Design a protein around this ligand. Structure first.
Ligand SMILES: [Zn+2]
Lengths: 220, 50, 64, 51, 377
DNA sequence: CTAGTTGATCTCATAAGGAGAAGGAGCAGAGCGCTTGAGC
């Protein structure tokens, strides 16, 4: 179990064509813990591999522990094709050439951004224009991924959906082989395989192994 | 302030409802030069979004 | 009337809730900081103040 | 926005009592409480006191 | 077992190896009151426990009704399954009783003749153990959520108390003081804990999701405001993601353990403050009050027993693996204490009983009439 | 360019309504993806 390997698999699962090649392929830290049993180390590998500049971990808002992952190169290649042709395309390019390869912190302070990156107080709206700078608070702001709205809406919808059917299942159990074999519900479009990894990481289910494969149960 | 804040996002400060859809397009077409009517329609349509 | 009360144990203002259950002719009042519960037999006429009175009277009676 | 003296004139008494306008009194109240708030927020103050 | 004994008398293994190995084996074999029982005098739920620093024999306890009961924890009888009797109890009839719920109690380090209890009645009381009366009463403007005394400092007797107010209060047993106050927090301070390694180093955890490492001698703010993601570095640098309601230094004081209502637990370096990125899984924590937990001492690998709903979770401190869940209670557990000498655990919860967790795997040898299946044939 | 002088200027110091419009609550039903689910 390697975090380099772990993140790669999730990346493959992503429905790339579903979002018209605009949102870079997000993979969650929750589903990272699914492939690698020892979470204790998964964070440690991704930590140095964060400052290694080959990954971007973006903080999301669907829960307190919402930390998404965006591929660095793909994060780069997609912002220009989204920013260019727009009024905000000006200093977002600077943000890219200066801020991204010099820092890896999840949220930038006011004095940090203005001084270290030499940002004015007028162009800062342009980064807020299309998913570049979120709003942590008055003094700090988390790093944004453009066009993240649609993803989480489907993501949250999907999580609820899978949770619901699992509960509905007779005797409140549902075999994992019975998810893949059965057609994915139309309510969730991110992929049934994508979400089942999420609850495993979120510990909403436990991977109980038996003679008939592995089973998931709500916590007792 | 109440109405505008309820219409816009609390976190990312964006319009809750996509503005390119036919419903908003026809609402805007009807409300040409009527900002009060536009606000009323937008508010009563975006109040249901959670 | 008021529904947020002060817990007699943990001394937190506006930190008590009253549960309404006409069907079971009973009511429950519980805190939020320390979560101390109490149940009393209520009727169609009982009010959230009444369950406080029953609880606080029992507390004083238990303190006797 | 502070109104000028024309909007809130200082009336003249039959003697020399220069009564200020009610808007001027409210403005003075606002300035004193704003200075108190500024000094409180620059120094150490409780959250409930600031509220 | 036998190999550890033989390797000891032969000299191949240093004598500490068997002791640490047998200590950690006892922790793994922890189970309910196989040979014990705690006398029940707390009418309400029990909020705090503390074992005396020396000789680990008498244990204090503080209930939700305000009574504080001092216990006895060794078998003065010949027979087993002894009951842990109470030598004394400060109840309602006492003139100086906590009127309201007592939140945390603590034995004074270096001797057992004095102990301090702080309640929600906005007072910290100094007690005389022998006469069971008070000596100093410290009233506070807001309710008191926790108080800690330095277990290793010998140059001072400062007691640190965190109130509902946004600012730490440092009372000195020597003289009255009660005026030294630490600023830098924004909301209710739910946990304070001194550092067992450094005398003047204090950790304060408050509802603004910030834990601050203070130096009492220092006259200029805090030293380290622990952050979660280790960015470059206040009104920022959140220690957790909710309400930090727990604090427990490790045995040597080199690392810090914190529990918040984000259902997350973190281990932090004591000197620099960087988190060590031990994930611990999900640690259930919905308590709005101070959550008291302990860490094992004198074992092969240190353990941490943290309250987990109606159960107690055991994790390896550094490995961060879930060892076992001690399902004994019926209501939520809020305090757990560790008997270092015997590797035993005492748990206070809200079902008004202190449960003892004693090591198993030692049973009487017969020459069980209740242990059979009764299935029909 | 330099001192010395004169005012400004400040700071600190002791004590027996209404009609209507707007929001929200609660229940009530329609619809629909879903999850079975069992009769021919
Ligand atoms: Zn209470």
């Amino acid at each position: 179990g390697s975090a380099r390997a772990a993140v790669s698999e999730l990346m493959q699962l992503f429905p790339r064509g579903l979002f018209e090649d605009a949102l870079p392929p997000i993979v969650l830290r929750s589903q990272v813990y699914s492939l690698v049993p020892d979470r204790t180390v998964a964070d440690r590998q991704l930590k140095e591999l964060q400052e290694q500049g080959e990954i971007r971990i973006v903080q999301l808002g669907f829960d307190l522990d919402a930390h998404g992952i965006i591929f660095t190169e793909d994060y780069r290649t997609r912002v220009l094709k989204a920013c260019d042709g727009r009024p905000y395309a000006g200093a977002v390019q600077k943000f890219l050439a200066s801020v991204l390869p010099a820092c890896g912190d999840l949220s930038f302070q006011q004095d940090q951004m203005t001084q270290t990156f030499g940002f004015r107080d007028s162009e800062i709206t342009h980064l807020v224009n299309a998913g570049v700078l979120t709003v942590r608070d008055a003094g700090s702001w988390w790093l944004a991924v453009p066009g993240a709205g649609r993803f989480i809406k489907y993501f949250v919808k999907g999580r609820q959906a899978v949770l619901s059917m699992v509960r509905k299942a007779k005797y409140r159990e549902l075999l994992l082989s019975e998810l893949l074999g059965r057609r994915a519900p139309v309510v969730v479009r991110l992929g049934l395989t994508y979400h089942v990894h999420d609850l495993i990481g979120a510990q909403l289910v436990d991977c109980i192994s038996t003679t008939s494969g592995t089973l998931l149960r709500l916590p007792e | 302030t109440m109405k505008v804040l309820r219409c816009v996002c609390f976190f990312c400060s964006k319009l809750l409802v996509d503005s390119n859809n036919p419903k908003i397009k026809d609402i805007l077409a009807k409300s040409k030069g009527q900002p009060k009517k536009r606000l009323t329609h937008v508010y009563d349509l975006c109040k249901g979004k959670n | 009337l008021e529904t947020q009360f002060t817990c007699p144990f943990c001394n937190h203002e506006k930190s008590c809730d009253v549960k309404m259950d006409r069907a079971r002719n009973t009511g429950v009042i519980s805190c939020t900081v320390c979560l101390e519960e109490f149940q009393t037999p209520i009727t169609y006429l009982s009010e959230p103040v009444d369950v406080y009175s029953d609880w606080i009277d029992a507390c004083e009676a238990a303190n006797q | 926005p502070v109104p000028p003296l024309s909007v809130r004139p200082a009336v003249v008494m039959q003697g020399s009592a220069r009564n200020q306008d009610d808007l001027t009194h409210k403005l003075a109240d606002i300035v004193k409480i704003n200075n108190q708030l500024r000094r409180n927020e620059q120094n150490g103050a409780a959250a409930h006191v600031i509220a | 077992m036998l190999g550890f004994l033989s390797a000891r008398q032969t000299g191949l293994e240093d004598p500490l190896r068997l002791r640490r190995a047998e200590s950690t084996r006892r922790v793994l074999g922890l189970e309910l009151n196989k040979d014990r029982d705690v006398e029940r005098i707390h009418g309400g739920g029990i909020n705090t426990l503390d074992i005396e620093p020396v000789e680990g024999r008498y244990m204090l306890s503080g209930g939700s009704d305000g009574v504080i009961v001092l216990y006895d924890l060794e078998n003065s009888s010949r027979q087993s399954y002894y009951t842990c009797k109470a030598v004394c109890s400060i109840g309602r009839d006492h003139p100086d009783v906590h009127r309201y719920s007592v939140e945390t109690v603590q034995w004074y380090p270096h001797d057992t003749g004095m102990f301090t209890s702080s309640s929600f009645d906005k007072t910290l009381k100094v007690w005389d153990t022998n006469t069971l009366q008070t000596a100093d009463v410290f009233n506070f403007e807001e309710t008191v959520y926790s108080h800690h005394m330095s277990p290793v400092s010998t140059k001072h007797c400062l007691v640190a108390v965190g109130t509902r107010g946004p600012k730490v209060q440092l009372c000195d047993l020597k003289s009255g003081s009660c005026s030294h106050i630490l600023q830098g927090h924004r909301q209710e301070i739910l946990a304070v804990s001194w550092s067992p390694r450094y005398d003047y180093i204090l950790a304060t955890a408050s509802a603004d999701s910030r834990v601050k490492l203070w130096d009492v001698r220092r006259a200029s703010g805090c030293l380290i405001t622990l952050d979660q993601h280790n960015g470059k570095k206040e009104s920022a640098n959140t220690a957790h993601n909710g309400k930090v309601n727990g604090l427990c230094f490790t045995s040597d004081g080199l690392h810090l353990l914190t529990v918040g209502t984000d259902n997350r637990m973190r281990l932090w370096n004591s000197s620099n403050g960087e988190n060590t990125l031990v994930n611990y899984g999900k640690v259930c924590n919905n308590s709005k009050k101070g959550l008291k937990f302990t860490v094992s001492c004198g074992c092969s690998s240190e353990f941490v027993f943290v309250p987990y709903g109606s159960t107690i979770a055991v994790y390896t401190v550094y490995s961060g693996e879930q060892i076992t869940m001690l399902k004994g209670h019926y209501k939520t557990v809020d305090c757990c204490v560790f008997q270092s000498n015997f590797q035993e655990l005492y748990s206070g919860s809200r079902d008004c009983n202190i449960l003892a967790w004693v090591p198993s795997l030692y049973e009487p040898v017969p020459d069980n009439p209740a242990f059979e299946d009764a299935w029909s044939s």
